[PDB]
Design a protein around this nucleic acid. Structure first.
Ligand SMILES: [K+]
Ligand SMILES: [K+]
Ligand SMILES: [K+]
Ligand SMILES: [K+]
Ligand SMILES: [K+]
Ligand SMILES: [K+]
Ligand SMILES: [K+]
Ligand SMILES: [K+]
Ligand SMILES: [K+]
Ligand SMILES: [K+]
Ligand SMILES: [K+]
Ligand SMILES: [K+]
Ligand SMILES: [K+]
Ligand SMILES: [K+]
Ligand SMILES: [K+]
Ligand SMILES: [Mg+2]
Ligand SMILES: [Mg+2]
Ligand SMILES: [Mg+2]
Ligand SMILES: [Mg+2]
Ligand SMILES: [Mg+2]
Ligand SMILES: [Mg+2]
Ligand SMILES: [Mg+2]
Ligand SMILES: [Mg+2]
Ligand SMILES: [Mg+2]
Ligand SMILES: [Mg+2]
Ligand SMILES: [Mg+2]
Ligand SMILES: [Mg+2]
Ligand SMILES: [Mg+2]
Ligand SMILES: [Mg+2]
Ligand SMILES: [Mg+2]
Ligand SMILES: [Mg+2]
Ligand SMILES: [Mg+2]
Ligand SMILES: [Mg+2]
Ligand SMILES: [Mg+2]
Ligand SMILES: [Mg+2]
Ligand SMILES: [Mg+2]
Ligand SMILES: [Mg+2]
Ligand SMILES: [Mg+2]
Ligand SMILES: [Mg+2]
Ligand SMILES: [Mg+2]
Ligand SMILES: [Mg+2]
Ligand SMILES: [Mg+2]
Ligand SMILES: [Mg+2]
Ligand SMILES: [Mg+2]
Ligand SMILES: [Mg+2]
Ligand SMILES: [Mg+2]
Ligand SMILES: [Mg+2]
Ligand SMILES: [Mg+2]
Ligand SMILES: [Mg+2]
Ligand SMILES: [Mg+2]
Ligand SMILES: [Mg+2]
Ligand SMILES: [Mg+2]
Ligand SMILES: [Mg+2]
Ligand SMILES: [Mg+2]
Ligand SMILES: [Mg+2]
Ligand SMILES: [Mg+2]
Ligand SMILES: [Mg+2]
Ligand SMILES: [Mg+2]
Ligand SMILES: [Mg+2]
Ligand SMILES: [Mg+2]
Ligand SMILES: [Mg+2]
Ligand SMILES: [Mg+2]
Ligand SMILES: [Mg+2]
Ligand SMILES: [Mg+2]
Lengths: 20, 154, 102, 123, 319
RNA sequence: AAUAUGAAUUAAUGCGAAGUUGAAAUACAGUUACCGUAGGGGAACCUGCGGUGGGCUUAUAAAUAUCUUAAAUAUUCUUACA
RNA sequence: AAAAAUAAAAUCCAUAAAUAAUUAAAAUAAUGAUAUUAAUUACCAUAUAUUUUUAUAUGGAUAUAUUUUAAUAGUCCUGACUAAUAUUUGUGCCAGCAGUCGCGGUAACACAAAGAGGGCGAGCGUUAAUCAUAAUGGUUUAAAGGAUCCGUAGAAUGAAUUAUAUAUUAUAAUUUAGAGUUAAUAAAAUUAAUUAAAGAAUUAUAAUAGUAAAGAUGAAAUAAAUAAUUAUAAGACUAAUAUAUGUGAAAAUAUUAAUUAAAUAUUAACUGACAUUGAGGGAUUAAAACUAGAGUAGCGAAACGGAUUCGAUACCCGUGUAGUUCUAGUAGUAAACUAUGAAUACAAUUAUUUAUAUAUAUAUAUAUAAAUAAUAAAUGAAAAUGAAAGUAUUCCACCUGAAGAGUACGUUAGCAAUAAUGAAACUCAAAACAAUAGACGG
RNA sequence: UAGGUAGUAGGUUUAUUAAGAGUUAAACCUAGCCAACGAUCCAUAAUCGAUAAUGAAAGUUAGAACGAUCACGUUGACUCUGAAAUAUAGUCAAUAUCUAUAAGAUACAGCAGUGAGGAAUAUUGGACAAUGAUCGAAAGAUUGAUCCAGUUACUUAUUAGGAU
């Protein structure tokens, strides 16, 4: 649960940084 | 024989992959008409009658004595590191023959999938047989002929 | 890489390309048709400059292999009208384009 | 398969969702009488005291229905209305009772999503 | 990835600092007051460069990208004014080079993000009278006037129809001072049409694009075979495109070729009218198998596509 | 006689927690596993007979070597000689 | 950059309704249930001008003006799929939420709420249903090639030329490239069935001298010998060669000989598409098992003992019954495996054998097939396949998540064990393959 | 559900009918007919469209509404009249109810309405003005056909305030 789902939020977060 | 025609279409694809300049096909009226259409449409460089061993240099009359040893020799074309004749497939298959009226042939050439036959693509040749003569589909439409959709060459 | 484009808007004809487990069926479309394809293919078409396209992906829908398959299909599975004409020694006419010509 | 095998029946299996509420007999909901109210333990990794109820539907089928919401006044012989929908963590509980219908009242003091818990709008 | 994003200005503005607890202000509201400038006692925004209409036939369309959000200028000298630390408006430190040489196309583009939308040219009151007098008095055809002034035939026909309405209004003194004031103001806001200016002239070769032709058919013919528009038309089973253009130019009511008589072949009977009868019967010959309301036709009244029409009186009626 | 219903009565099986008796399988799993079949045993399993590899192709030396002008000559050479 | 918020109020201007007048049309010869008609007009009527419409002026009508006048939406949702960033409170694996993955054990974006936000909107949500959403599929290794071959139907497929016809079919004639028949020449000695033989060894018995231990195991112990040399009897098996090479439909098949049957290549002549595949059906089919009668050395389920062990219903040892053998049958199952159905056309190389043919300056050389090995291309989830698992065509069998289950019930067949056929419910969001990097390995 | 069929398959003749035929009844012959491309049997279901839903499409689903067709009017059989009826007729019987107790009448699947069942589907309304239908020479009479309204967000559509 941790490994698989943790990145969903981070990789979308990477996209958050892209707009920043 | 549609089986023989399927064998020839597969044979030409195999020869194109290895890029042999010259190959032979069975000597029959259907095969000769098929090859002649490809030659006139620019898919084949040459079309010569011959034997099992090679094309004839001088005319050799065909008779029952040598019919079993006759072959048709066709020259394949390659330009810019690409085969001109890349694919050759039957439409009307031995176990499912497709006869279309001229109206449905016009729809096939207009982008409409008829009886699961994908429509004619740019630069593709679709051959039709009518009264034992092979012609391009566009020519059959010009002559108002209904016929069997045999094969598509690209 | 440069990809051939028919009228700088679409592909030349239809493409049935197999890239590993991905079966790509791409069809050319009329002007103003838009991109109606897998989302991965949509992004590639946008960057490449393809505006009109229809298609369906069968078997594997792995995003990575769809993208690579699409790029490969646009280069190895297309032939320009000019290349077909020269190879066959024939003239290929776009009927729709001639209809609106002088 | 060959062309003749397709002619003889061979083909792709059809895709259509299957019924998950067979006891309702293709009805949106069915009235029933509570036989016994019970408390059940979720399957792991969940932990809770899930309120359920055994119900005899008007068609004779006896089912186990989950009582949603915080707090319920369901008892034996209470008239309840059962709808489709399973309780994922409770195996064998494939139905829901409708709050605010029959003898089961709406959730007390429910503010949000009231329509799902039979709670009327506060003036 | 997507999140809610408050629509803050893309250009730099003076954000709110420490605020007195009762102001309850927002950064969006303060950015708007900076765009608008001060509001006078009359409720006007004189410092905003868009408050007043242009009077030189050049549209004053918003150019936020080129002026970087600086919308304030002196109301009389039209000289840029920007906010300073003191809270006052004064000359900018550096001139804006992006606002002095603007492309001609951009001047007519009202929306910064859409360069495919341009304003149309207003026709001068003189050209309209000339067109009106040529079609009506001199008896020229709409095709001739269209090819002369570079205007599409429908626009030519509309000008005649509208000038007729302006004559009746001026013949009954229905054009008031306010209407005259408004008309002149709006006339001085748009670029005037110049029949001589080639770029301003409207394209006169446009035809509707059919659907059967929209597909892409290809023919492999002999390398030296000529194939032209007429041959293509035969392949697509359509009239030549030039013929379509010619048939579309004979549609104007004042255009040459306008003809409608092949339909005057339907027997009609007007029933006898007697004194006291409130209506007359009109009978139109029809053919069995075509006339009549069909039996078992699809009822669409309870469907989203229910047919809705309008009668001669303009009343909404179900069809 | 069939169909439906209930039914004394009786068979098979799933899940849930949860201990217990052993340690059968996965490494050479500590007796190679499995297939068919037969017998035996609290339980897994054990034993006989043939079959399969989804285990051993994972495969890797008994070694032994020779004479023609060593240069005033080959080694150098830059479009030259011929 | 944290807003709520142009939102509110307020200001300007409207229309609906009301009120008043007017009033069609459904229907006309007349008749209107609907009906307190729709619509229109804003003091009513009239004249003139006047796309519409507008405008002026008039007759009557009220005190210069002319009826009055508005605007309270719900419902779901904001972790991902999936639009919803402004934060905050309560709860603490409880309460509860949940279409799927999941959330909750004290900083809960998921529970219950506040703020803010996103949908749809006189509807919103929810349940029950329908359509769509992958066969432009697969079966060596993931669900799936039938044990094998023979062959019937096939409303399955299938050569060549010409001429007709009503035309991808039919008919006729003609043809020999597929498929066959016979012979000639050369080659080979295998595979079936049957009959007749041989061989090494083993066990038992007896004799002989010769002794006191022998046999077994990890170590042990259980049951005139052991060893040696002779003689006799019995049953089963088949060392090297040997590669199961080869042969056979598969299962199978390697001591010898014989009889019968079948099997190879090329050439000559002949038939003239007579072919391919094959539902059903038929035949054959290891080991075990069973029926009847013989046989029984060795081996060996079971059983009874000896050991080992904490225990040992085992692994090891002893005694050893069924069985293993033969004859006549039943049965038709195996990891019956290449985990890969059969046929045809075709495609780039090398190496090594084999076969036939050719040549000679006689032992090689040159040809054409087959087999095997390694590959190109191609294919593939990859491992890999490689003349197929490539490019194509034809026919058959089979598969459609896991578990339940090759089970239950019924039926058919069998002496019997059983074999074939072969479900559903319940439950779950799993389950599986190839490959990668580790860890571990008595 | 693997065998089924015995008027069963076919032939000949009469009866019956406007008329063919094992359609029905009688007689006499032949041994056939159907079936693993599914017979027979069992279960389920009114059928369909230029109708509705869905899809790119082939299709799939529905069969309420509009229209077409069939069957039935509490159940079964039979008869009469007739061109045509096993008639919503008549006869007899079955089931239920009723009052007049008779070889009786009734059967709401006509309209409205009631109880029951169910998650769930409405007024015991107005009018023959319109379109039809029946009777009448006509005047006209009748018409729960039909046309209207009522109930119900069940569906669709319009409106449900603009500028500042
Ligand atoms: K074991
Ligand atoms: K076994
Ligand atoms: K065993
Ligand atoms: K809302
Ligand atoms: K595979
Ligand atoms: K072998
Ligand atoms: K012949
Ligand atoms: K056959
Ligand atoms: K068979
Ligand atoms: K024995
Ligand atoms: K094997
Ligand atoms: K087969
Ligand atoms: K049947
Ligand atoms: K109804
Ligand atoms: K009437
Ligand atoms: Mg909720
Ligand atoms: Mg989002
Ligand atoms: Mg052990
Ligand atoms: Mg073990
Ligand atoms: Mg082991
Ligand atoms: Mg034992
Ligand atoms: Mg064994
Ligand atoms: Mg292993
Ligand atoms: Mg291995
Ligand atoms: Mg009003
Ligand atoms: Mg009237
Ligand atoms: Mg908290
Ligand atoms: Mg959520
Ligand atoms: Mg919440
Ligand atoms: Mg709130
Ligand atoms: Mg609505
Ligand atoms: Mg599909
Ligand atoms: Mg296969
Ligand atoms: Mg096999
Ligand atoms: Mg198998
Ligand atoms: Mg031959
Ligand atoms: Mg001895
Ligand atoms: Mg041997
Ligand atoms: Mg071999
Ligand atoms: Mg066969
Ligand atoms: Mg025996
Ligand atoms: Mg033993
Ligand atoms: Mg047998
Ligand atoms: Mg078995
Ligand atoms: Mg088997
Ligand atoms: Mg074997
Ligand atoms: Mg064969
Ligand atoms: Mg069995
Ligand atoms: Mg693996
Ligand atoms: Mg008769
Ligand atoms: Mg009969
Ligand atoms: Mg008879
Ligand atoms: Mg029914
Ligand atoms: Mg249907
Ligand atoms: Mg209906
Ligand atoms: Mg149906
Ligand atoms: Mg109805
Ligand atoms: Mg009836
Ligand atoms: Mg009846
Ligand atoms: Mg009756
Ligand atoms: Mg009744
Ligand atoms: Mg009723
Ligand atoms: Mg009820
Ligand atoms: Mg009435």
């Amino acid at each position: 649960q941790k490994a698989r789902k943790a990145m969903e939020s981070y990789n979308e977060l990477e996209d958050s940084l892209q707009f920043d | 024989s549609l089986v023989k025609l399927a064998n020839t279409c597969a044979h030409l694809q195999n020869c194109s992959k290895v890029r042999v300049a010259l190959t032979s096909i069975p000597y029959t009226k259907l095969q000769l008409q098929f090859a002649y259409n490809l030659y006139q449409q620019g898919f084949l460089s040459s079309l010569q009658k011959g034997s099992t061993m090679g094309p004839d240099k001088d005319f050799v009359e065909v008779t029952p004595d040598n019919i079993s040893t006759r072959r048709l020799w066709v020259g394949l074309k390659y330009r810019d590191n690409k085969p001109v004749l890349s694919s050759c497939k039957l439409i009307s298959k031995p176990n499912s023959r497709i006869h279309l009226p001229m109206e449905d042939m016009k729809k096939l050439c207009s982008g409409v999938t008829i009886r699961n036959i994908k429509p004619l693509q740019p630069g593709e040749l679709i051959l039709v047989r009518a009264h034992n003569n092979i012609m391009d589909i566009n020519e059959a439409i010009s002559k108002k002929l209904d016929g069997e959709v045999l094969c598509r060459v690209k | 890489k440069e990809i051939p484009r028919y009228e700088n808007r679409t592909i030349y004809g239809d493409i049935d390309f197999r890239y590993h487990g991905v079966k790509l069926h791409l069809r050319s479309a009329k002007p103003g048709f838009g991109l109606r394809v897998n989302h991965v293919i949509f992004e590639i078409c946008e960057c490449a400059g393809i505006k009109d396209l229809s298609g369906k992906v069968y078997k594997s829908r792995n995003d990575m292999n769809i993208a690579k398959g699409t790029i490969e299909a646009f280069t190895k599975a297309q032939k320009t009208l000019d290349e077909v004409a020269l190879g066959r020694g024939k003239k290929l006419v776009d009927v729709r384009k001639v209809y609106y010509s002088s | 398969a060959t062309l003749n095998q397709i002619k003889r029946g061979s083909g792709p299996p059809r895709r259509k969702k299957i019924s998950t509420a067979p006891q309702l007999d293709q009805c949106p909901q069915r009235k029933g009488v509570v036989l016994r109210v019970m408390v059940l333990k979720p399957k792991k990794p969940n932990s809770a005291q899930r309120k359920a109820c055994r119900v005899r539907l008007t068609n004779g089928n006896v089912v186990s229905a989950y009582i949603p919401g915080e707090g319920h006044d369901a008892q034996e012989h209470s008239i309840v209305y059962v709808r489709g929908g399973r309780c994922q963590d409770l195996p064998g509980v494939k139905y829901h009772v409708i709050r605010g219908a029959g003898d089961l009242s709406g959730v007390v003091n429910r503010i949000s999503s009231r329509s799902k818990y039979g709670a009327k709008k506060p003036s | 990835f997507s999140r809610r994003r408050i629509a803050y200005p893309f250009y730099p503005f003076k954000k709110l600092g420490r605020q007195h607890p009762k102001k309850h202000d927002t950064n969006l509201k303060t950015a708007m007051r900076q765009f608008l400038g001060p509001k006078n006692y009359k409720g006007e925004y004189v410092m905003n460069k868009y408050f007043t209409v242009p009077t030189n036939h050049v549209p004053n369309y918003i150019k936020p990208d080129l002026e970087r959000g600086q919308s304030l200028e002196h109301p009389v000298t039209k000289k840029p004014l920007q906010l300073r630390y003191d809270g006052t408006l004064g000359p900018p430190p550096v001139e804006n080079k992006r606002l002095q040489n603007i492309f001609k196309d951009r001047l007519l583009q009202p929306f910064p993000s859409n360069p495919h939308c341009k304003t149309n040219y207003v026709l001068s009151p003189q050209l309209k009278q000339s067109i009106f007098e040529e079609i009506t008095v001199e008896g020229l055809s709409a095709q001739q006037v269209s090819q002369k002034y570079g205007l599409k035939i429908p626009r030519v026909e509309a000008i005649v129809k509208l000038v007729s309405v302006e004559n009746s209004w001026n013949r009954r003194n229905r054009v008031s001072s306010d209407l005259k004031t408004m008309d002149e103001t709006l006339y001085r806001m748009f670029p005037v049409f110049d029949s001589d200016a080639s770029f301003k002239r409207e394209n006169l070769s446009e035809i509707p694009v059919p659907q059967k032709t929209l597909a892409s058919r290809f023919l492999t013919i002999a390398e030296s075979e000529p194939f032209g528009p007429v041959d293509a038309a035969h392949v697509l089973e359509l009239e030549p495109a030039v013929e379509t253009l010619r048939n579309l130019s004979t549609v104007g009511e004042h255009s040459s070729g306008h003809q409608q008589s092949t339909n005057k072949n339907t027997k009609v009977i007007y029933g006898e009218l007697v004194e006291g009868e409130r209506s007359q019967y009109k009978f139109t010959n029809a053919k069995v198998g075509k006339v009549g309301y069909r039996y078992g036709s699809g009822n669409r009244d309870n469907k989203k596509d229910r047919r809705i029409g309008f009668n001669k009186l303009g009343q909404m009626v179900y069809i």
